[PDB]
RNA sequence: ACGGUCGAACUUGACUAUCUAGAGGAAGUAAAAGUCGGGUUUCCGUAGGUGAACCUGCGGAAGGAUCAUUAACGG
RNA sequence: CAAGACGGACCAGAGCGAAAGCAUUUGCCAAGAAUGUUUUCAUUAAUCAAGAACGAAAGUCGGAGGUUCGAAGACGAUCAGAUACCGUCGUAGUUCCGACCAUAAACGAUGCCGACCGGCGAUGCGGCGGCGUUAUUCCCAUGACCCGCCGGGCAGCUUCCGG
RNA sequence: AAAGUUGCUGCAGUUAAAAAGCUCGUAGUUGGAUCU
RNA sequence: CGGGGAAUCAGGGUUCGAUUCCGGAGAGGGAGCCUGAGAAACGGCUACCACAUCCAAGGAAGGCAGCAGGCGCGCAAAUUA
C-alpha cells in the first residue's frame, strides 16, 4: 500500500517520476530517441524529392495495389514512402519534383491497409493534389 | 568543529510540496565564525548567529550565543 | 576416452583420465560459447537485413 | 509478535487493580529495602531479587510496598552494576554462541542466531546510548566481548 | 504495531454499526477519542457511553443507535486553513445538509461549522454521517 | 627597448567527436519456369547432446478426473 | 567376508525451522517457539534504500571415494524418408571434505505489522478444573486414558458477513 | 481534457501485466495511555 | 534565458511562456583597452581567428541579433512607403 505520512512528499514525487517513465506516450515524448528517429524532425510537414514510384500491396484480407512514391526529404536526406490518395492522382507526379508530405493520421503509425506507410503527399510542384484532382489549377514543371 | 576559529552548523527545515500537500526534510550547512569567548562549545549544541559582512569566501554569520545540548548538563 | 575405470586402477591413472575429461569439457564449453556468439551476430545481421528490405526497395515499380 | 521470531505469544503478567499493600503483609518498606540490600550483597539481578521476594516473602510488588522499583533502590544505595541486566545477558548469550562457533565450523544455524543476537545487542546499546546509561563511546566488539561479562 | 488509536476506535464503531450491534467495546481509550465521541454524541449520532478505568489505558463501552452511516478518520492530520475547508467538506461529506468534519483547533476539538463560527482552522481528525 | 601582466591565437603528441571521398569484401531483392533434385499431460531451473528448437539426466510444480474400506481389540 | 549407498513400513493435511529444508540408536554442544508468572527494564518499537547471512537440483575448482543409478557415448533392434522412444553396457556425475556459483512452478501462482467483522469441533504443544478406569484391585503422589476451559500453532468444515 | 490508462485527492499486483527465495539491517517514513 | 503571465481544467492537476512589462545576456568568435559620472561600449578603438570589400598590387576599408530590404534556410513570417 501507499505511504501516506505527512513528511513523505519526496518519496511520492520520486516514485511518480520513476513510474512515469513506464508509460508509452511519456517515454516517446521525453526520452529523445523518437524525435531523432522521426523523419520529419518533429514537423507537421516536410518537402522532398521523388525518387521512385512504387506499388505497395494491401495487407492480407484486402487485395489492392496502393500507389505510393519513394521520396527523399530535403532537409535531412532521409528516405520516405508516401501514399498518393485519390484515384488517378499518381499521374500528376513525375520523377524528381518537389513534393509536400504530411502525416497520414496516427502520429507515426501505419494507417489502414497500407503496410509501413506513415505519410501522405499533399502538394506536388507547389499545387495541391486536391486542386489538381478537382481540376482547379494546373502544375508546371 | 575542525576549522580555525570557525565552525559548521546545519539548519533543518521542512519544505512544502503542494501537489502532494506534504513536506520533505531539507537542510543547509553554514560555516560561521566562533569567537574564542565561547569556549567549550561542543558538537550538537544549539547556536544563535547574526548576519554580518562577508568575512570569508563562505562565512557570512557570526556566533552570538550558544545554548548547550538538550541533555548536556 | 570411453575407457571404463578398472578396479586395479590406482592414482595418477584415474587422475590422468579425470583431468582429460575436465580439459575436454572446458574446450567444448569454450567452443559452445563461440557458436552461441556467432549465431547471435548472424541473427542480428539478418534482422537488420529484413528490416531494411521492408523499409525500402520493396514493391512494384 | 516477537521482534525476531514469527511467533505471537500472550504470556505475560497481569497486575491487579489494587495498588495497595495487602493487610497480611507485615513488612515495612525499610525491611523490604534491607532484604534487597542483602540479596544484592549475595549478588543477583533485580529480576532475581523480585522473584525471590515474590516467592518466599509474600511481597507481591516491591514498588507498591517501598514506593520505588528495585533497580532504583539499588542505584540509590550504590549496588547497581555498570552495564544493564538485559544487555549483559544478551552479551553473555552472544559469547556462548561465539564459543560454540569456534568449536564447530559447519554450523550455519548458530551463525544465523548469532547475527540475530548481535542485532539485539546493537539495538539495546543504541537505546542506552540515547538515555545516557552507557558511555557514548561504548561499543560491542567481536573480539573484546567476554571482557565485559 | 498499533498506531492511531482514534483510527482503531472509529473503525470498530463503524464495523459494529454495519452489523447492527447494540454496544461496542473500544480499547485503548484516549482524550482525543473521548472528545470525538462527545462531538458525535451532541449531534445525536453515537449515544451515551462509559469509560472503564483499568489503571492502564482505559476501555470505552459505547451504546449505539442505528443512526451512524459512516464514521471515519482522515490520516495524516492535515493542516486545514479556513479557506480550504470548503474543498474538504466537498470531498468527505455526502450532503451540504448533514455530516461532520471533526477537526482539532486551538479552541478545542469541534466540528467544521463550529470552526466557521469561531473563525479558526486546525487539523482534520474525521467526519461522520 | 628591457622586464611584468592580462591574453587572443599558433605549433606539436595524446584522448577524442564530427564532416566528407574511397579500391575491395560479404549480402539480400527484381529479371533467368535456365542445370540438378510419426510423436508429444502441461511446465520450471540447470547440464549435456553441432547455436536455438527438441530430447535425455537431476531436483521441483499442478496451472492434472479420489473409487472402495475403516464402531470390536476381549477370555 | 568387504565396500559404498540409503534410513522403508511406523509417517499422519502430525511436528520443527527464516527460508532452502528436516526421520536408525546413544552421548556431547550451543540455540529456539509456545506456555506460566502479583519478576525486571520502561517505549527500547513497526517497515525498511544501502549493506550482510543462508539459499533445492544442476554446474565449476582442489583432495578422497566409487555400491547403485546414469546426462554424453558405444552397440542391438526398428523404417517410403528416422537421426527420439526401447534393451544391454557405460563416462562425467550421483557420496564425502574445503572452496566457488546464487538460480527453481524457490507457490497460497496470494508483502510485513496492527485493529475490527459469524459459528463449530477435532488436532499439536503448554497450563488450569474434575467425577471415574488403569500401572496384574497400584499403599501415596505420578504416567496412560476420560470430560470441560484458556493461550499461541498446522489444518479443516459450515455460512446469503461483506466483497 | 477525456485518462480513476501515472492514481495526493484516486488505480493496481490468486487465476488477466505485476509481491524480492528467505531473514537481518542503516538512512528514510511512521510511532501506545499519561499532566486543568 | 528567469519572472509577471498563457492554454486547459469539477476538485486536485498537466502543459506552455523566443515574444512588446520587470531582470539578465550579447552584438561574427575570443581577448584587451581609450574616454568618461557611468562601457570591458562594438551605428568606439586595438589585435588574433573566420569571413569578406575596393585596388593603379604600394595600400585602404569592414560587422543589420536597429528600420526597411536581399540571399540562404526551411512546413513556417509584411513596405527598400
UniProtKB/Swiss-Prot annotation, chain A:
Resulting phenotype, residue 66 to K: In BTDD; decreases hydroxylation of the protein; decreases the accuracy of translation; decreases levels of incorporation of the mutant protein into ribosomes and polysomes; patient cells become highly sensitive to oxidative stress
Processing after translation: Hydroxylation at Pro-61 affects translation termination efficiency.
Keyword ATP-binding attached: no
Pfam families: Ribosom_S12_S23
Compositional bias annotation for Basic residues: 1-19
Molecular function as annotated in GO: RNA binding; structural constituent of ribosome
PTM-bearing positions, type 3-hydroxyproline: 61
Cross-link (Glycyl lysine isopeptide (Lys-Gly) (interchain with G-Cter in SUMO2)): 36
Transmembrane segments: none
One Gene Ontology biological process: translation
Residues with PTM N6-succinyllysine: 53
Matches recorded under InterPro entries: NA-bd_OB-fold, Ribosomal_uS12, Ribosomal_uS12_euk/arc
PTM sites of type N6-acetyllysine: 134
Cysteine disulfide partners in this protein: none
Compartment(s) where it occurs, according to its Swiss-Prot or TrEMBL record: Cytoplasm, Cytosol; Cytoplasm; Rough endoplasmic reticulum; Nucleus, Nucleolus
Disordered, as annotated region: 1-25
Record note on quaternary structure: Component of the 40S small ribosomal subunit. Part of the small subunit (SSU) processome, composed of more than 70 proteins and the RNA chaperone small nucleolar RNA (snoRNA) U3.
Family assignment from sequence similarity: Belongs to the universal ribosomal protein uS12 family.
Disease: Brachycephaly, trichomegaly, and developmental delay: An autosomal dominant developmental disorder characterized by brachycephaly, ciliary trichomegaly, dysmorphic features of the face and hands, hearing loss, and developmental delay with short stature. Intellectual disability and autism spectrum disorder may be present in some patients.
Protein name per the record: Small ribosomal subunit protein uS12
Organism: Homo sapiens (Human)
UniProtKB/Swiss-Prot annotation, chain B:
Function: Component of the small ribosomal subunit. The ribosome is a large ribonucleoprotein complex responsible for the synthesis of proteins in the cell. Part of the small subunit (SSU) processome, first precursor of the small eukaryotic ribosomal subunit. During the assembly of the SSU processome in the nucleolus, many ribosome biogenesis factors, an RNA chaperone and ribosomal proteins associate with the nascent pre-rRNA and work in concert to generate RNA folding, modifications, rearrangements and cleavage as well as targeted degradation of pre-ribosomal RNA by the RNA exosome.
Keywords, in A-Z order: Acetylation, Citrullination, Cytoplasm, Lipoprotein, Methylation, Nucleus, Palmitate, Phosphoprotein, Ribonucleoprotein, Ribosomal protein, RNA-binding, rRNA-binding
GO terms of biological process kind: cytoplasmic translation; ribosomal small subunit biogenesis; translation
Modified positions (Phosphoserine) in chain numbering: 31
Family in the record: Belongs to the universal ribosomal protein uS17 family.
Phylogenetic placement of the source organism: Eukaryota, Metazoa, Chordata, Craniata, Vertebrata
Disulfide bonds: none
Quaternary context: Component of the small ribosomal subunit. Part of the small subunit (SSU) processome, composed of more than 70 proteins and the RNA chaperone small nucleolar RNA (snoRNA) U3.
Any one GO molecular-function label of the UniProt entry: RNA binding
Signal peptide residues on this chain, from the entry's feature table: none
Repeat in keyword set: no
Residues of the full protein shown: 80 to 152 of 158
Species the sequence originates in: Homo sapiens (Human)
Name of protein: Small ribosomal subunit protein uS17
Compartments where located: Cytoplasm; Nucleus, Nucleolus
Post-translational modification: Citrullinated by PADI4.
UniProtKB/Swiss-Prot annotation, chain C:
Biased composition annotated in UniProt, kind: Basic and acidic residues: 6-34
Subcellular location field: Cytoplasm
Coiled-coil regions listed: 5-61
Tissue specificity comment: Expressed in the epidermis.
Disordered, as annotated region: 1-34
Family recorded in the similarity comment: Belongs to the LTV1 family.
Associated disorder: Inflammatory poikiloderma with hair abnormalities and acral keratoses: An autosomal recessive disorder characterized by mottled hyper- and hypopigmentation of the skin, sparse scalp hair and eyelashes, sparse or absent eyebrows, and palmoplantar keratoses.
Name of the protein this chain belongs to: Protein LTV1 homolog
Organism this protein belongs to: Homo sapiens
Span within the parent record: 414 to 474 of 475
Curated annotation (Swiss-Prot), chain E:
Any single GO BP term: positive regulation of cell cycle
Alphabetized UniProt keyword annotations: Cytoplasm, Diamond-Blackfan anemia, Nucleus, Ribonucleoprotein, Ribosomal protein
Disulfide bonds: none
Residues modified to N6-succinyllysine: 87
GO molecular function: RNA binding; structural constituent of ribosome
Known disease link: Diamond-Blackfan anemia 20: A form of Diamond-Blackfan anemia, a congenital non-regenerative hypoplastic anemia that usually presents early in infancy. Diamond-Blackfan anemia is characterized by a moderate to severe macrocytic anemia, erythroblastopenia, and an increased risk of malignancy. 30 to 40% of Diamond-Blackfan anemia patients present with short stature and congenital anomalies, the most frequent being craniofacial (Pierre-Robin syndrome and cleft palate), thumb and urogenital anomalies. DBA20 inheritance is autosomal dominant.
Name of this chain's protein: Small ribosomal subunit protein uS8
Source organism of this protein record: Homo sapiens
